[PDB]
Amino acid sequence: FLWFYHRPVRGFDC
Amino acid sequence: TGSFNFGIGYGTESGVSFQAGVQQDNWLGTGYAVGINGTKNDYQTYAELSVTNPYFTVDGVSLGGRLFYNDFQADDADLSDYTNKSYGTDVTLGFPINEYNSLRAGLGYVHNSLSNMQPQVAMWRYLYSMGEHPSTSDQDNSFKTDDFTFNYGWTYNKLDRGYFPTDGSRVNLTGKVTIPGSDNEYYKVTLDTATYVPIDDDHKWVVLGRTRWGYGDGLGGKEMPFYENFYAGGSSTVRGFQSNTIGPKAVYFPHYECAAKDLCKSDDAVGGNAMAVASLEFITPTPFISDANSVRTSFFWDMGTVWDTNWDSSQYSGYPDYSDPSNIRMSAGIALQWMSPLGPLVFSYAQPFKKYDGDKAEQFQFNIGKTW
Amino acid sequence: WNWSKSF
Ligand SMILES: CCCC[P+](CCCC)(CCCC)CCCC
Ligand SMILES: CCCC[P+](CCCC)(CCCC)CCCC
């Protein structure tokens, strides 16, 4: 939702 | 007119990440942008076709549809081992509510194909809830589901600027629920918040408060599938902890290995159906440099926990109680962000000064370019 | 890094 925080593990809808 | 692209990024969460796509706005004059994209990193390969009309109505209600497939290798994600090859499709209406708020509603179909699951308690407890009874003594297994979901989203964005924000907040709420007819039966909700409060008039001194919340559970006697678990730990969540280390750890059956005539504790993370992260971060002027407005320096305090609400302690009194939400991990550290010529760059060094058994440390973390 | 070229 915001760089660089809370990158999904199962990408890639961030 | 259209374009193509390719990209490379690198980070401790993902390793090397490769992106490539072709895109065309207003494809064949339909009013729909059409994209075909793929991304690959150490543990995942994903491709999709998207078809998107941002002005499905003249008011900027958007309609998007996608097809995708995914290959996920859990062991390369620092999890207990399984393979999940999936594919599906979704359709999403995007509603602009006002300057600061948008909503999303969507339907999704997904086919999950699980194989190569190393037998472990939490995973098998899910499988059993599904009426499935694979052997506990080998990795030769297969488990397939077909789910239909209602997908909803709310984004609140009132940041002063997107590049190094100094003021305002961003909130993202995502939910989904299976629709009758699905194999799985569960709901899942995620909430991300970031709030920036500037201290000085020049906004060079900024307090960031960041949270993350995840809760999902089965409806009826079914559990949320493990392949939808939340994780924490890593360069973007709780710094100083190895990717995905925080929370329950696999309890393997006789078959880190357990290859042994008893159940075997491990330090392989499996995630959980509940998760919470909070972080306080003080942004300060970058020391021993001057201009200074292209770098952001900060000190932070990171905390997080992950748990398994269906972990059955009474049966497994001899093991850590993975249903306990109160094993809060904490780290302190420093971070730097910079728009490098290789693309957006973040570096952090952080010490995990509160951890639990099996948790793994990763003091130095970074991410360069797109890894998302 | 990301390289992008139109046609
Ligand atoms: C590239 C042209 C896209 C056309 P649409 C549907 C095509 C059917 C095969 C896109 C739907 C996205 C979910 C539009 C339908 C209007 C109601
Ligand atoms: C500096 C911004 C702090 C924002 P909050 C506190 C986050 C803890 C790290 C709320 C503070 C109220 C006074 C988080 C609101 C969403 C749960």
Short mmCIF file of C-alpha atoms and ligand atoms in Angstrom, two decimals:
data_model
loop_
_atom_site.label_atom_id
_atom_site.label_comp_id
_atom_site.label_asym_id
_atom_site.label_seq_id
_atom_site.Cartn_x
_atom_site.Cartn_y
_atom_site.Cartn_z
CA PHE A 1 0.00 0.00 0.00
CA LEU A 2 2.96 2.39 0.44
CA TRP A 3 6.65 2.34 -0.54
CA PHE A 4 8.40 0.51 1.20
CA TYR A 5 5.92 -1.10 3.59
CA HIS A 6 3.94 -4.33 3.65
CA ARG A 7 5.10 -5.99 0.45
CA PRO A 8 2.87 -9.04 -0.11
CA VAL A 9 4.59 -12.38 0.02
CA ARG A 10 2.11 -13.86 -2.47
CA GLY A 11 2.69 -11.13 -5.06
CA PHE A 12 1.86 -9.08 -6.87
CA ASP A 13 -1.21 -6.95 -6.15
CA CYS A 14 0.72 -4.26 -4.27
CA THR B 1 -0.31 4.11 -28.47
CA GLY B 2 1.35 1.20 -26.64
CA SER B 3 4.62 0.08 -25.04
CA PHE B 4 6.66 -2.76 -23.59
CA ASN B 5 9.00 -2.87 -20.59
CA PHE B 6 11.30 -4.98 -18.46
CA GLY B 7 12.63 -4.47 -14.98
CA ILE B 8 15.02 -5.79 -12.41
CA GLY B 9 14.95 -5.27 -8.70
CA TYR B 10 16.58 -6.91 -5.74
CA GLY B 11 15.76 -7.24 -2.07
CA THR B 12 16.24 -9.43 0.96
CA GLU B 13 12.52 -10.39 0.92
CA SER B 14 12.47 -11.56 -2.70
CA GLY B 15 16.01 -11.92 -4.06
CA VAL B 16 16.34 -10.80 -7.67
CA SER B 17 12.99 -9.86 -9.13
CA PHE B 18 12.34 -9.71 -12.89
CA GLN B 19 9.37 -7.92 -14.45
CA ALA B 20 8.28 -7.74 -18.08
CA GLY B 21 5.12 -6.61 -19.83
CA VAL B 22 3.45 -5.21 -22.90
CA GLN B 23 0.73 -2.59 -22.53
CA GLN B 24 -1.54 -0.69 -24.91
CA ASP B 25 -3.94 2.06 -23.87
CA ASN B 26 -7.26 2.08 -25.70
CA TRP B 27 -6.56 -1.29 -27.38
CA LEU B 28 -8.26 -1.56 -30.80
CA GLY B 29 -10.22 1.59 -29.81
CA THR B 30 -12.21 -0.34 -27.18
CA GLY B 31 -11.48 2.18 -24.41
CA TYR B 32 -9.80 -0.61 -22.42
CA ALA B 33 -6.12 -0.65 -21.58
CA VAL B 34 -4.71 -4.12 -22.17
CA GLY B 35 -1.66 -5.43 -20.35
CA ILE B 36 0.23 -8.70 -20.26
CA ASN B 37 2.75 -8.81 -17.42
CA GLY B 38 4.93 -11.36 -15.68
CA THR B 39 7.07 -11.18 -12.53
CA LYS B 40 9.52 -13.71 -11.11
CA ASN B 41 11.58 -13.74 -7.90
CA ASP B 42 13.22 -16.45 -5.80
CA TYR B 43 9.99 -18.18 -4.86
CA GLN B 44 7.26 -16.97 -7.18
CA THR B 45 6.41 -16.70 -10.87
CA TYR B 46 3.27 -14.81 -11.86
CA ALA B 47 1.73 -13.71 -15.14
CA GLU B 48 -1.47 -11.91 -15.94
CA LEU B 49 -3.52 -10.42 -18.69
CA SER B 50 -5.46 -7.32 -17.62
CA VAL B 51 -8.17 -5.40 -19.43
CA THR B 52 -9.04 -2.09 -17.77
CA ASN B 53 -11.33 0.78 -18.53
CA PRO B 54 -10.61 3.62 -16.03
CA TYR B 55 -13.69 5.48 -17.28
CA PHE B 56 -16.18 2.62 -17.38
CA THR B 57 -18.54 5.47 -16.53
CA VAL B 58 -17.83 9.11 -17.39
CA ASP B 59 -17.44 9.80 -13.63
CA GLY B 60 -14.33 7.59 -13.46
CA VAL B 61 -15.93 4.42 -12.09
CA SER B 62 -13.49 1.85 -13.44
CA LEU B 63 -13.99 -1.69 -14.68
CA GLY B 64 -11.11 -4.15 -14.80
CA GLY B 65 -10.84 -7.85 -15.61
CA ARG B 66 -7.84 -10.15 -15.32
CA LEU B 67 -6.66 -13.67 -16.00
CA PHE B 68 -3.62 -14.94 -14.13
CA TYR B 69 -1.53 -17.88 -13.09
CA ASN B 70 0.95 -18.26 -10.26
CA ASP B 71 3.61 -20.72 -9.17
CA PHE B 72 4.61 -20.37 -5.51
CA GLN B 73 7.37 -22.32 -3.80
CA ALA B 74 6.88 -21.88 -0.04
CA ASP B 75 10.33 -23.16 1.04
CA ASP B 76 11.98 -20.47 -1.06
CA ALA B 77 9.77 -17.96 0.79
CA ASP B 78 11.37 -19.09 4.10
CA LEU B 79 8.27 -21.12 4.93
CA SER B 80 7.62 -24.81 5.52
CA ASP B 81 7.58 -26.49 2.15
CA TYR B 82 4.76 -26.78 -0.31
CA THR B 83 4.06 -25.88 -3.92
CA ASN B 84 0.99 -23.90 -4.92
CA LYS B 85 0.29 -23.53 -8.62
CA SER B 86 -2.83 -21.54 -9.15
CA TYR B 87 -4.72 -19.62 -11.77
CA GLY B 88 -7.87 -17.60 -11.96
CA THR B 89 -9.74 -14.53 -13.06
CA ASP B 90 -11.38 -11.55 -11.43
CA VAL B 91 -13.48 -8.53 -12.23
CA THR B 92 -13.33 -5.31 -10.22
CA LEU B 93 -15.42 -2.13 -10.15
CA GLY B 94 -13.40 0.90 -8.86
CA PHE B 95 -15.52 3.70 -7.33
CA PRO B 96 -14.03 7.18 -6.67
CA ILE B 97 -15.96 8.37 -3.60
CA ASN B 98 -14.21 11.73 -3.22
CA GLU B 99 -10.76 13.23 -3.47
CA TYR B 100 -9.40 11.08 -0.61
CA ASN B 101 -11.47 7.89 -0.78
CA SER B 102 -12.08 5.08 -3.25
CA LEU B 103 -13.91 1.76 -2.93
CA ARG B 104 -13.49 -1.50 -4.86
CA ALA B 105 -15.88 -4.40 -5.32
CA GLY B 106 -15.03 -7.51 -7.28
CA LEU B 107 -15.68 -11.17 -7.93
CA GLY B 108 -12.86 -13.67 -8.27
CA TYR B 109 -12.37 -17.29 -9.24
CA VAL B 110 -9.23 -19.11 -8.18
CA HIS B 111 -8.02 -22.65 -8.61
CA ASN B 112 -5.33 -23.72 -6.16
CA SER B 113 -3.20 -26.78 -6.70
CA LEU B 114 -1.16 -27.79 -3.66
CA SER B 115 1.50 -30.46 -3.85
CA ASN B 116 4.80 -31.31 -2.26
CA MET B 117 3.47 -30.46 1.19
CA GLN B 118 5.86 -31.49 3.94
CA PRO B 119 3.45 -32.93 6.57
CA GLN B 120 3.00 -30.66 9.59
CA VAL B 121 0.30 -30.19 12.17
CA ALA B 122 -1.27 -26.84 11.32
CA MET B 123 -1.28 -27.68 7.60
CA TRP B 124 -2.84 -31.11 8.19
CA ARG B 125 -5.38 -29.66 10.61
CA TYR B 126 -6.55 -27.44 7.73
CA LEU B 127 -6.62 -30.39 5.33
CA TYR B 128 -8.64 -32.47 7.78
CA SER B 129 -11.15 -29.64 8.17
CA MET B 130 -11.54 -29.98 4.38
CA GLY B 131 -12.27 -33.76 4.62
CA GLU B 132 -8.81 -34.56 3.20
CA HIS B 133 -6.51 -37.11 4.80
CA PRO B 134 -3.10 -37.26 3.06
CA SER B 135 -0.40 -39.50 4.49
CA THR B 136 1.73 -37.87 7.20
CA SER B 137 4.88 -39.80 6.25
CA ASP B 138 5.74 -38.43 2.81
CA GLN B 139 5.73 -35.33 0.60
CA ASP B 140 3.79 -37.04 -2.18
CA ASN B 141 0.41 -35.37 -2.09
CA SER B 142 -2.01 -33.26 -4.03
CA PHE B 143 -4.87 -31.04 -2.85
CA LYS B 144 -6.95 -28.88 -5.17
CA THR B 145 -9.56 -26.21 -4.49
CA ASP B 146 -11.81 -24.00 -6.58
CA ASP B 147 -13.05 -20.83 -4.92
CA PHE B 148 -15.35 -17.96 -5.84
CA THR B 149 -14.82 -14.78 -3.82
CA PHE B 150 -16.43 -11.43 -3.24
CA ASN B 151 -13.55 -8.93 -2.94
CA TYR B 152 -13.82 -5.50 -1.39
CA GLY B 153 -11.40 -2.66 -0.84
CA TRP B 154 -11.25 0.82 0.66
CA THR B 155 -8.36 3.19 0.10
CA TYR B 156 -7.99 6.42 2.03
CA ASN B 157 -5.18 8.63 0.76
CA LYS B 158 -4.52 12.12 2.17
CA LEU B 159 -0.75 12.36 1.97
CA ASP B 160 0.79 15.75 1.18
CA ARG B 161 2.92 14.04 -1.45
CA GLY B 162 3.67 10.44 -2.48
CA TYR B 163 7.47 10.91 -2.62
CA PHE B 164 8.75 11.18 0.96
CA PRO B 165 5.36 12.19 2.50
CA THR B 166 5.62 14.53 5.49
CA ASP B 167 1.97 14.86 6.46
CA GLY B 168 -1.32 12.97 6.34
CA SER B 169 -2.32 9.33 6.28
CA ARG B 170 -2.92 6.41 3.97
CA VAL B 171 -5.29 3.59 4.94
CA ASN B 172 -5.98 0.44 2.91
CA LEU B 173 -8.73 -1.98 3.96
CA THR B 174 -9.12 -5.21 1.98
CA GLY B 175 -11.63 -7.98 2.62
CA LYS B 176 -12.72 -11.15 0.95
CA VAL B 177 -15.24 -13.91 1.51
CA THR B 178 -15.93 -17.17 -0.31
CA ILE B 179 -19.28 -17.44 -2.06
CA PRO B 180 -21.43 -20.62 -1.66
CA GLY B 181 -20.20 -23.12 -4.24
CA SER B 182 -16.56 -22.64 -3.20
CA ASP B 183 -14.56 -25.53 -1.79
CA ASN B 184 -13.06 -23.28 0.91
CA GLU B 185 -15.31 -21.31 3.26
CA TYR B 186 -13.68 -18.36 4.94
CA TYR B 187 -13.27 -14.62 5.12
CA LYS B 188 -10.13 -12.54 5.38
CA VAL B 189 -9.59 -8.87 6.28
CA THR B 190 -6.42 -6.74 6.12
CA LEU B 191 -5.89 -3.15 7.29
CA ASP B 192 -2.81 -1.05 6.55
CA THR B 193 -2.30 2.43 8.05
CA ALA B 194 0.47 4.95 7.80
CA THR B 195 0.21 8.36 9.39
CA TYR B 196 2.81 11.11 9.02
CA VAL B 197 2.88 13.92 11.59
CA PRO B 198 5.43 16.69 10.86
CA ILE B 199 7.05 18.29 13.93
CA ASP B 200 8.83 21.36 12.47
CA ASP B 201 7.46 23.98 10.07
CA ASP B 202 9.85 22.78 7.35
CA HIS B 203 8.65 19.16 7.77
CA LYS B 204 12.21 17.81 8.01
CA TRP B 205 11.31 16.16 11.30
CA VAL B 206 8.42 13.71 10.84
CA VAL B 207 6.83 11.00 12.97
CA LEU B 208 5.49 7.98 11.08
CA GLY B 209 3.10 5.65 12.85
CA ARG B 210 2.38 2.50 10.87
CA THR B 211 0.07 -0.42 11.57
CA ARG B 212 -0.99 -3.62 9.89
CA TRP B 213 -3.83 -5.98 10.88
CA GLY B 214 -4.79 -9.33 9.42
CA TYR B 215 -7.59 -11.60 10.47
CA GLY B 216 -9.14 -14.49 8.61
CA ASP B 217 -11.07 -17.55 9.72
CA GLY B 218 -13.14 -20.42 8.36
CA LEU B 219 -16.91 -20.34 8.27
CA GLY B 220 -18.48 -23.57 9.43
CA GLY B 221 -15.96 -26.15 10.59
CA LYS B 222 -13.58 -25.44 7.70
CA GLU B 223 -10.45 -23.40 8.39
CA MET B 224 -8.95 -20.60 6.35
CA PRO B 225 -6.54 -22.32 3.93
CA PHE B 226 -2.91 -22.07 5.04
CA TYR B 227 -2.08 -20.80 1.52
CA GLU B 228 -3.91 -17.56 2.49
CA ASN B 229 -1.96 -17.13 5.76
CA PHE B 230 -0.51 -13.82 6.88
CA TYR B 231 3.19 -13.41 7.64
CA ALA B 232 5.48 -10.86 9.26
CA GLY B 233 9.19 -10.20 9.50
CA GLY B 234 11.28 -8.64 6.78
CA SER B 235 12.46 -5.48 5.15
CA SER B 236 8.94 -4.04 4.73
CA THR B 237 7.14 -5.21 7.90
CA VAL B 238 9.24 -5.86 11.01
CA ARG B 239 12.86 -4.92 10.26
CA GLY B 240 15.67 -7.00 11.73
CA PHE B 241 13.75 -10.27 11.38
CA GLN B 242 14.18 -12.65 8.48
CA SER B 243 11.38 -12.58 5.90
CA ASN B 244 8.28 -14.25 7.26
CA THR B 245 9.97 -15.66 10.39
CA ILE B 246 7.49 -14.23 12.91
CA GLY B 247 4.75 -16.43 14.29
CA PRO B 248 3.96 -20.16 14.38
CA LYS B 249 6.63 -22.64 13.32
CA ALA B 250 6.01 -25.96 11.63
CA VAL B 251 5.51 -29.00 13.80
CA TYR B 252 6.47 -31.81 11.42
CA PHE B 253 5.45 -35.45 11.57
CA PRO B 254 8.02 -38.29 11.41
CA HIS B 255 8.42 -38.99 7.69
CA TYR B 256 13.59 -28.52 10.16
CA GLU B 257 13.43 -32.06 8.67
CA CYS B 258 12.07 -34.88 10.90
CA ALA B 259 13.53 -37.66 8.69
CA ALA B 260 12.81 -39.53 13.92
CA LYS B 261 9.86 -41.49 15.35
CA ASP B 262 8.18 -38.47 17.01
CA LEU B 263 6.74 -35.02 16.14
CA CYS B 264 9.56 -32.51 15.46
CA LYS B 265 9.65 -28.84 16.41
CA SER B 266 11.29 -26.56 13.86
CA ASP B 267 12.12 -22.97 13.07
CA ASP B 268 10.33 -23.02 9.72
CA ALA B 269 7.68 -20.27 9.73
CA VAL B 270 4.18 -21.23 8.49
CA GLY B 271 2.34 -17.93 9.02
CA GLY B 272 -1.09 -17.74 10.63
CA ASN B 273 -4.69 -16.56 10.22
CA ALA B 274 -4.07 -13.54 12.54
CA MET B 275 -1.33 -10.89 12.40
CA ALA B 276 -0.59 -7.42 13.73
CA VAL B 277 2.25 -5.00 13.13
CA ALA B 278 2.91 -1.57 14.59
CA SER B 279 5.84 0.72 14.04
CA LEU B 280 6.95 4.12 15.24
CA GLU B 281 9.57 5.80 13.05
CA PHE B 282 11.21 9.22 13.48
CA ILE B 283 12.34 10.80 10.24
CA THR B 284 15.23 13.27 10.71
CA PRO B 285 17.32 15.43 8.33
CA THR B 286 19.99 13.25 6.70
CA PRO B 287 23.26 13.78 8.68
CA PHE B 288 26.55 15.04 7.16
CA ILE B 289 24.92 15.91 3.83
CA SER B 290 23.25 19.10 2.61
CA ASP B 291 21.11 20.41 -0.23
CA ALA B 292 19.47 16.25 1.48
CA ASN B 293 15.92 16.38 0.01
CA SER B 294 16.61 13.28 -2.08
CA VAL B 295 17.48 11.12 0.95
CA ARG B 296 15.30 10.19 3.93
CA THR B 297 16.92 8.95 7.14
CA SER B 298 15.04 7.55 10.14
CA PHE B 299 15.16 5.63 13.41
CA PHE B 300 12.38 3.20 14.15
CA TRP B 301 10.77 0.89 16.57
CA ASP B 302 9.10 -2.08 14.91
CA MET B 303 6.77 -4.64 16.49
CA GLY B 304 4.70 -7.53 15.18
CA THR B 305 3.06 -10.86 15.95
CA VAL B 306 1.43 -13.67 13.98
CA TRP B 307 -0.69 -16.45 15.40
CA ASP B 308 -2.89 -19.41 14.66
CA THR B 309 -6.29 -19.09 16.30
CA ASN B 310 -7.02 -22.79 15.62
CA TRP B 311 -3.80 -24.06 17.16
CA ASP B 312 -4.88 -26.62 19.77
CA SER B 313 -2.65 -26.22 22.79
CA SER B 314 -4.51 -28.76 24.94
CA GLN B 315 -3.71 -31.55 22.51
CA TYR B 316 -0.13 -30.21 22.05
CA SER B 317 0.66 -29.12 25.63
CA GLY B 318 4.28 -30.10 24.97
CA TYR B 319 4.70 -27.45 22.22
CA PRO B 320 4.70 -23.59 22.11
CA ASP B 321 1.12 -22.30 22.18
CA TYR B 322 0.93 -20.88 18.65
CA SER B 323 -2.59 -19.54 19.34
CA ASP B 324 -1.08 -17.06 21.80
CA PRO B 325 -1.25 -13.52 20.30
CA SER B 326 1.04 -11.98 22.90
CA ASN B 327 4.45 -13.08 21.56
CA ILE B 328 5.22 -9.61 20.32
CA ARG B 329 8.54 -9.32 18.52
CA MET B 330 10.35 -6.02 18.54
CA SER B 331 13.30 -4.46 16.85
CA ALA B 332 15.01 -1.09 16.74
CA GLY B 333 17.02 0.27 13.86
CA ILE B 334 17.93 2.89 11.29
CA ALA B 335 16.79 3.22 7.70
CA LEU B 336 17.75 5.17 4.61
CA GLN B 337 15.76 5.70 1.45
CA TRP B 338 17.07 7.25 -1.74
CA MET B 339 16.02 7.45 -5.38
CA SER B 340 19.10 5.66 -6.68
CA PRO B 341 19.97 5.38 -10.40
CA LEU B 342 19.01 1.70 -10.12
CA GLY B 343 15.61 2.91 -8.87
CA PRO B 344 13.99 3.50 -5.45
CA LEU B 345 16.35 2.23 -2.79
CA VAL B 346 15.85 1.51 0.90
CA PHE B 347 18.36 0.14 3.37
CA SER B 348 17.91 -0.68 7.04
CA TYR B 349 19.95 -2.02 9.87
CA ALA B 350 17.98 -3.19 12.88
CA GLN B 351 18.50 -5.38 15.95
CA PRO B 352 15.63 -7.67 17.08
CA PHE B 353 15.73 -7.01 20.81
CA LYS B 354 12.68 -9.16 21.48
CA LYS B 355 12.29 -12.55 19.84
CA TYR B 356 11.06 -16.06 20.49
CA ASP B 357 12.28 -19.57 19.76
CA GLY B 358 12.90 -20.32 16.12
CA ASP B 359 12.77 -16.64 15.13
CA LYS B 360 15.59 -15.75 12.78
CA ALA B 361 17.41 -12.44 12.66
CA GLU B 362 18.33 -10.42 9.59
CA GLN B 363 19.94 -7.24 10.76
CA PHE B 364 20.77 -5.73 7.40
CA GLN B 365 17.91 -5.47 4.92
CA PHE B 366 17.41 -3.62 1.67
CA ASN B 367 15.32 -3.40 -1.42
CA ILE B 368 16.23 -1.81 -4.76
CA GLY B 369 13.84 -1.09 -7.63
CA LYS B 370 10.48 -2.86 -7.98
CA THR B 371 10.18 -6.12 -6.05
CA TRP B 372 6.34 -5.88 -5.69
CA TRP C 1 15.43 -0.39 -12.58
CA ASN C 2 12.73 -0.51 -15.31
CA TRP C 3 13.23 0.13 -19.07
CA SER C 4 10.15 1.16 -21.08
CA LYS C 5 10.03 1.72 -24.92
CA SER C 6 6.92 2.65 -26.93
CA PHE C 7 5.98 1.51 -30.44
C1 LIG D 1 -10.76 -5.45 -24.62
C2 LIG D 1 -12.25 -5.25 -24.66
C3 LIG D 1 -12.88 -5.61 -23.35
C4 LIG D 1 -14.38 -5.81 -23.51
P1 LIG D 1 -15.24 -6.26 -21.99
C5 LIG D 1 -15.92 -7.92 -22.07
C6 LIG D 1 -15.35 -8.80 -23.18
C7 LIG D 1 -16.00 -10.19 -23.18
C8 LIG D 1 -15.07 -11.26 -23.66
C9 LIG D 1 -14.07 -6.20 -20.62
C10 LIG D 1 -14.57 -6.83 -19.33
C11 LIG D 1 -13.54 -6.74 -18.21
C12 LIG D 1 -14.00 -7.41 -16.96
C13 LIG D 1 -16.50 -5.01 -21.74
C14 LIG D 1 -17.92 -5.54 -21.63
C15 LIG D 1 -18.89 -4.40 -21.40
C16 LIG D 1 -20.06 -4.82 -20.56
C1 LIG D 2 2.19 9.19 14.55
C2 LIG D 2 0.91 8.65 14.05
C3 LIG D 2 0.35 7.68 14.96
C4 LIG D 2 -0.89 7.02 14.36
P1 LIG D 2 -1.68 5.78 15.43
C5 LIG D 2 -0.61 4.88 16.52
C6 LIG D 2 0.23 3.85 15.79
C7 LIG D 2 1.13 3.16 16.73
C8 LIG D 2 2.50 3.03 16.18
C9 LIG D 2 -2.97 6.62 16.35
C10 LIG D 2 -2.49 7.63 17.36
C11 LIG D 2 -3.66 8.26 18.04
C12 LIG D 2 -3.24 9.32 18.89
C13 LIG D 2 -2.45 4.48 14.49
C14 LIG D 2 -3.88 4.69 14.06
C15 LIG D 2 -4.36 3.43 13.30
C16 LIG D 2 -4.45 2.19 14.21
#
